[PDB]
Symmetry: C3
């Protein structure tokens, strides 16, 4: 268990939106990926560079009420203010009552809780969300991690039919973190690939009875993730991922997972 520190800034972006960044003027949507091992503590020295109050609230990880990031617990940040948020994590283990204490490991996320409303409705809509992965000892690490956020009817706040697209080579181990926000339920689908509906997205062995799926219903603040072997059994190609709610895909909730051959080529495709 490391004690770790990062800087985080909330920034209003040059278009209407709001993003978290590791440096001033470097905010992105989704915000930066934070990755911790069970047992790690992370102290986030957060600065609200904006002219309205903003905060940081995390799902899944251990935090005290002073890092709730809510007005209820007086832990939002005033305009131009600073505040150190502290996230802890723990490994699993046996309690003295005999029961098993679940570890912090999983696919989690952080978001604003005071911009617009006391639930972060405006901050979330504008782009103040990001992914957090907590790894258990032994967990398989990927070649790349891509984050896909279905925020109301947009993916990663991109306009309709404007990606994001993600590139990989055949055989790469690719991790996806899939988070949902806002008002609507969605169904996440990926062509050509499938995963297990469990903590890691991967079956533990022949005895794991988890459902293997390629389509999953998700609502606001749900998060899951998985790893696939890019192109496994299916080959290189533009593999669409999309919400499968028919009007949402028609409205533009679609992107591409472009899986290239080891020569860098891909079968020809005709994007929107």
């Amino acid at each position: 268990g490391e004690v770790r520190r990062i800087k985080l800034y909330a920034e209003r972006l040059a278009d209407g939106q709001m993003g978290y960044g590791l440096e001033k003027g470097r905010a992105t949507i989704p915000g930066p990926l934070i990755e911790l091992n069970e047992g790690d503590t992370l102290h986030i020295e957060f600065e609200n560079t904006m002219d309205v109050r903003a905060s940081l609230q995390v799902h899944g990880l251990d935090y005290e009420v002073s890092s709730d990031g809510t007005t209820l617990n007086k832990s939002d940040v005033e305009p131009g203010g600073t505040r150190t948020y502290t996230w802890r994590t723990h490994a699993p283990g046996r309690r003295s009552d005999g029961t098993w204490r679940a570890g912090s490991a999983g696919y989690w996320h952080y978001h604003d809780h005071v911009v617009g409303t006391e639930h972060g409705t405006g901050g979330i809509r504008k782009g103040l969300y990001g992914p957090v992965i907590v790894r258990r000892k032994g967990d398989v690490l990927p070649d790349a991690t891509h984050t896909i956020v279905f925020n109301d009817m947009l993916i990663n706040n991109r306009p309709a039919h404007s990606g994001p697209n993600f590139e990989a080579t055949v055989g790469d181990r690719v991790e996806f973190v899939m988070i949902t926000h806002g008002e609507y339920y969605h169904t996440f689908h990926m062509h050509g690939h499938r995963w297990a509906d469990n903590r890691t997205g991967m079956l533990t062995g022949p005895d794991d009875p988890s459902q293997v799926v390629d389509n999953k219903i998700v609502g606001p603040a749900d998060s899951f993730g998985f790893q696939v072997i890019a192109g496994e059994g299916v080959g290189a190609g533009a593999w669409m991922y999309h919400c499968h709610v028919q009007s949402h895909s028609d409205m533009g909730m679609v992107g591409l997972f472009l899986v290239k051959k080891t020569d860098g080529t891909i079968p020809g495709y005709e994007p929107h």
Copy 2:
């Protein structure tokens, strides 16, 4: 298991609401917690005190059609009538063909099926629902059980922004039963606490691959439950639970899990 008996009443309450109770004039929304162990049989001597037909339908448990609670199976109750409903439960075990029969244990719920419409739409909207827990041998029992029902846009049919709140002390084993009803999907989220998305909400040990979550999508008639150690690794505090659909939390689908230090105090909140 054991053969158990209870009486249950349906009654009208103020504001056109309707509720089940274990004694006349003590109807509540949600209705009483019913708890059984696998193998138990429960006979419910049900009296409909209201002036419209009503019934009792349960999820999960074993019942014959004569206790379906539906007009289809002629088992609703006339105004002022009484009917005995019988719920049975079974432990898991292997069938003669080697297949594994799942037990009755789970977090389940009962509700009306004939008020308003032949699917109980009015009776459910008005308050006729409650929780039933069926425990398996060796399950850990909690210090307290709280029931949270997302019924359309209300929690436990309370007005917007009026809880319910639930209190515990740091370290208490607290069980939550979470039931959803009506028209809408929701997402249930709890600050500072998490649970396993499996039967008990606790992982069975180091080999259980269940996702550990703090936010869960639910729809009408879904039920799940879990136990946490109150404030485990996070301390005392006013820990919100709420629907995480943004308009629903803005419109008041929020409550507090108030976890007090052993001296009874709580970090200052609001």
Copy 3:
């Protein structure tokens, strides 16, 4: 690992519907159930008999982009055209990185991806969907398999309050395939029966921590399945299945699982009056 071949047709049906069939003039909604064992390859000689482009896209199974059925991968079928799609499947096994590759087995489905929109919105609305089950070696085979598709507010595109109903006898091992399409979330519920929320719908043994449920939230393109012993612990009768979203059940997303005693009768079933 057998190589199998079938023909499939997409055809217009009455009343603005569309369906898949194994022969011309025999299209059904849902389309024909396709059943494979892990390791089998299926080549589907598909003919689009309609006046609009149409396709076949499958969930879960292995296919190259040439069998994607999308305009993005140029693998839909012009009016009157024919195309051979190929679906492959594999067994699970250990990869050389030490992880376990999930097998193809599961309850899956196929549907059009180009009628109406480049997401098949018009095709799926009209009836172009069907079930696919891929079995793992050793899986238990049922006495009967019934498919229930919640397509927007209709079940199997049938008029509201028109079923379908399915019949069994007490003790039958009955398999259900449950698929959802369109715009709405639903919750699938069955009276008197419950199943495990895992790959087969049955717990693998005392060690399997899966949730045992009788009610499950589903959204467009979700598919799951299960088997029950009909009437187990509850007896014969008309056992309702329905969406549990209240206005949906009120508007007719309801049907019956009709479970007969071994003497053939259904408790409480009295379609006719008697003299006196």
